């Protein structure tokens, strides 16, 4: 009954990803007030990337796992390119979302006078162009495979080079931006609590800091726990050490972040309300 | 003072508004009912109009 | 003296109430009980007008039933072509806090006003082709809340200083002043013959004024809160009011009392605007809960709902031929609905 459980779990994961990201993409077409903000542009870019993960990558790997072999012939190279491109696009969209939030919070006036929708299109285009360049150009030229099923390992040169661009630089940027955001929020909380204390003393704090820590830790921890072990074994393996099953488990862990992305970046009051209007119109 | 002037002005205004002639509510309600009947045909919102002569299609 | 005058006023009020009660024979509901109901009214958004950058506060139809003006809290006064959705004019306003606008029956002028306490007249047909201010009417000591053209040379305005005035646009002087309201006057409605007009103020009362005589002839009470909207029946012998207490009432001039009340149990938001159909059978009202309800004027039954505005419905209007209904809203959009 192990195979039945595995098939059910993989089907549930793919369905969750596809349903959630379709809901996110649909909630923006039905409402024109969400399309007026640029942060929503970045959110829908991330949702599109997650949809491409769920459609072009996940089902074919699950078929090979349930069947026990790769039945798609020469689709391995195109599938590998799709995998790299979609995952990279998701991570770069997350990095751009963090940078946008940091610029909004730290410089509100210059943000309002410089975050025209033209700049958002430039950022999105840069992210997607970087994804396509890192994936399809080296794979078609067979630079990903070592010079001396679809269960191979990347080349030594390509594994570290792609991991640095796709993961480590975006992770560094996100850490910097969210640390600065945390510091700003702490200063504001202290300033608010000082006035509250003055008024209380005239009459006769930890909750907010807990909320800030909860939000930031959820974001960062979900991202890092989903994608970090994969990008460590992605550079350990080409120099080999583990089997081909634990690596598949960590690959699936990395892909499952796209399932959770809608409820972390598109779950505010505006999106939650739009998720109820489209749910039975009640 | 101005208070006595305001009070006397209010009393005078109330005097004029009590001198009007009032018809029965039965007659007034029938007149409005008859107006709607005599003009129900020419109300495009009450009776939907075919798209042949509708200028908002 | 003060006690005597107060007692006299109370006795006069009691006499008026007694006369009104005596003249009441049967309710409007009893008379219109065998009338066949209108059924369900189904209207759809035929047009959507875009171009205003902020909340829309007022709109008005032209007498040709094609052109309409609207006002926004961004200093813009836009004239539309409702058939082709094109914009004919866009007038920048000196003050950004407009709250009313009107269209002249001739079609050569539009009016405007708000928190600046000024009513501005604009010439739409001039030699240069560009719209320029023709007159500024000063004299009110409160915000302009409504204005309505009588002809090309007269206009009646209501203000937040509890006063209505009649103006001569050629000289810019108040010909008549209508006093008697104790709260801020919020709305106006001219009779079909432009011989009388009704106003509704924040003292929860409505008054009927003789334009030439300059005196208040009748006062109507029954609303528990501020009256925000007022509209004459197409006959000219009745009118309807909308208030903050989430109800609409119909008053008869000859009966001198309220006839029908238009309320529902699941309505708690106030009425912003109110209007009638060409036959007078339907009563359309705008609400704070973002949609417009359609009422049967003779049965007080809700015959439909116009939904599709993202924010508060601020203004409302029915064309002179009865073809279409326009609604403006705080979401900065104008929608045109047809049967």
């Amino acid at each position: 009954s192990v195979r039945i459980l595995t098939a059910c779990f993989l089907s549930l994961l793919i369905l969750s990803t596809l349903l959630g990201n379709t809901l996110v993409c649909a909630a923006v077409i039905r409402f024109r007030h969400l399309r007026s903000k640029v942060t929503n542009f970045f959110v829908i870019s991330l949702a599109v990337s997650d949809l491409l993960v769920a459609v072009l990558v996940m089902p074919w790997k699950a078929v090979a796992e349930i069947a026990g072999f790769w039945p798609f012939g020469s689709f391995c190279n195109i599938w590998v390119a799709f995998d790299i491109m979609c995952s990279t696009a998701s991570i770069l969209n997350l990095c751009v979302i963090s940078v946008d939030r940091y610029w909004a919070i730290s410089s509100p006036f210059r943000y309002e006078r410089k975050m025209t929708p033209k700049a958002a299109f430039i950022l999105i285009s840069v992210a997607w162009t970087l994804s396509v360049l890192i994936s399809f150009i080296p794979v078609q030229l067979s630079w990903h495979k070592a010079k001396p099923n679809c269960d191979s390992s990347l080349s030594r040169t390509y594994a570290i080079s792609s991991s640095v661009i796709s993961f480590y630089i975006p992770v560094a940027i996100m850490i910097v931006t969210y640390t600065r955001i945390y510091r700003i929020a702490q200063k504001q909380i202290r300033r608010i609590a000082a006035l509250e204390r003055a008024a209380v003393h005239a009459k006769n704090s930890f909750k907010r800091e807990t909320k800030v820590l909860k939000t930031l830790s959820v974001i960062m921890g979900v991202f890092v726990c989903c994608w970090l072990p994969f990008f460590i074994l992605n550079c350990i393996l080409p120099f080999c050490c583990i089997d081909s099953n634990t690596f598949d488990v960590f690959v699936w862990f990395g892909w499952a972040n796209s399932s959770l992305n809608p409820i972390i970046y598109a779950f505010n009051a505006d999106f939650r309300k739009a998720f109820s209007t489209l749910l039975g119109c009640y | 003072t101005a208070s006595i002037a305001q009070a006397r002005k209010l009393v005078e205004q109330l005097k004029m508004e009590a001198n009007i002639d009032r018809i029965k509510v039965s007659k007034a309600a029938a007149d409005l009912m008859a107006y709607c009947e005599a003009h129900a045909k020419e109300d495009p919102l009450l009776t939907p109009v075919p798209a042949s002569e509708n200028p908002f299609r | 003296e003060l006690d005597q005058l107060r007692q006299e006023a109370e006795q006069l009020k009691n006499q008026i109430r007694d006369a009104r009660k005596a003249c009441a024979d049967a309710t409007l509901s009893q008379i219109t009980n065998n009338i066949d109901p209108v059924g369900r009214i189904q209207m759809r958004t035929r047009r959507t007008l875009r171009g205003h950058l902020a909340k829309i506060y007022a709109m008005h139809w032209g007498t040709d039933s094609r052109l309409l003006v609207s006002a926004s809290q961004d200093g813009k006064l836009i004239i539309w072509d409702s058939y082709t959705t094109n914009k004919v004019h866009a007038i920048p306003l000196r003050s950004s806090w407009v709250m009313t606008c009107a269209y002249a029956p001739s079609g050569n002028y539009v009016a405007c006003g708000g928190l600046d306490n000024i009513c501005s007249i604009y010439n739409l047909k001039t030699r240069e082709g560009n719209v320029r201010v023709s007159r500024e009417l000063a004299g009110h000591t409160g915000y302009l809340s409504c204005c309505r053209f009588l002809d090309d040379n007269q206009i009646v305005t209501s203000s937040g200083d509890t006063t209505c005035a009649l103006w001569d646009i050629e000289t810019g002087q108040q010909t008549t002043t209508f006093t008697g309201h104790t709260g801020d006057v919020m709305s106006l409605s001219l009779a079909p013959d432009t011989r009388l007009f009704v106003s509704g103020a924040c003292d929860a009362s409505a008054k009927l004024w003789d334009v030439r005589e300059g005196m208040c002839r009748q006062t109507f009470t029954g609303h528990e809160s501020d009256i925000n909207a007022i509209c004459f029946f197409p006959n000219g012998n009745a009118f309807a009011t909308g208030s903050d207490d989430a109800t609409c009432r119909l008053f008869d001039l000859r009966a001198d009392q309220e006839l029908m009340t238009y309320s529902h149990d699941n309505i708690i938001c106030g009425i912003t605007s109110v209007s009638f159909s060409k036959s007078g059978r339907l009563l359309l009202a705008g609400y704070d809960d973002f949609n417009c309800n359609v009422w049967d004027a003779l049965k007080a039954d809700r015959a439909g709902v116009l939904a599709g505005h993202d924010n508060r419905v601020s203004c409302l209007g029915v064309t002179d031929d009865g073809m279409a209904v326009a609604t403006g809203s705080w979401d900065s959009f104008l929608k045109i609905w047809n049967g």
């Binding site: 919070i105 509100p108 006036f109 700003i184 | - | 928190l115």
Partner: protein, 238 residues
């Protein structure tokens, strides 16, 4: 139907010419911040307006660091029951000006200011709007407290049991008596402000004078803080 075609072409051309100008106005509208200015006649609200600049509603435009501000004065033959208060439900902030030296003047003018502040704070149309509180005329208040027989405790009995807070930053040359009165009045306003706060709007009190070159910077910085807090709130970080 060539005449109809020409008419439609002219109408489309005029519409396009109109819509070109509406695009620049949209750009100008988004960069501007609207301010509602409240106060009394006896407060130094007029002199502050004159410094900022250097019938009905009065409007003042000024620009700081490429940010455009638009301030509106509603002191035009007004009264209570402010029906027009719903026109300003989407301004950046409210500037409330109080004459702190008018506690003794007559039922007090300071009590009238406190009642007006409490009325404005709890208004249903102003539930997401922050107030920049200008506690004006500090020199006159200092003169009254230092020399004179006008005891503050005579009019406000709670002054007999008030102690200067810990988060007090007196000027180097100020008497300890003057500091206590300033912070007593500030806390009198802050008690109203915090007794009914929603978490969607705050109060930014300042000790000002009518002739100051710092008030514009105060407004700028407080609006910057307001926008930053709104951003932090929309991301569940506040």
């Amino acid at each position: 139907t060539e005449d109809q075609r020409n008419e439609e072409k002219a109408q489309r051309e005029a519409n396009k010419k109109i819509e070109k100008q509406l695009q620049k106005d949209k750009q100008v509208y988004r960069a501007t911040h609207r301010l509602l200015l409240l106060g009394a006649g006896e407060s130094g609200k007029s002199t502050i307006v004159k410094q900022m600049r250097i019938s009905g509603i009065f409007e003042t435009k000024f620009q700081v660091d490429k940010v455009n501000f638009h301030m509106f004065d509603v002191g035009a033959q007004r009264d209570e029951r402010r029906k027009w208060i719903q026109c300003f439900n989407d301004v950046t902030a409210i500037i409330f000006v109080v004459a702190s030296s008018s506690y003794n003047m007559v039922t007090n003018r300071l009590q009238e200011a406190l009642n007006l502040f409490k009325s404005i704070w709890n208004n249903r149309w102003l539930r997401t709007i922050s107030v920049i509180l200008f506690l004006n005329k500090q020199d006159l208040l200092a003169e009254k407290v230092l020399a004179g027989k006008s005891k503050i405790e005579d009019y406000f009995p709670e002054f007999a049991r008030y102690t200067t807070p810990e988060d007090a930053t007196p000027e180097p040359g100020e008497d300890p008596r003057v500091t206590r009165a300033k912070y007593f009045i500030r806390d009198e306003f802050l008690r109203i402000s915090t007794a009914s706060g929603d978490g969607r709007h705050y109060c930014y009190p300042h000790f000002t004078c009518s002739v100051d070159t710092e008030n514009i910077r105060r407004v700028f910085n407080d609006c910057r803080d307001i926008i930053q807090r709104m951003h932090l709130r929309q991301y569940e970080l506040l």
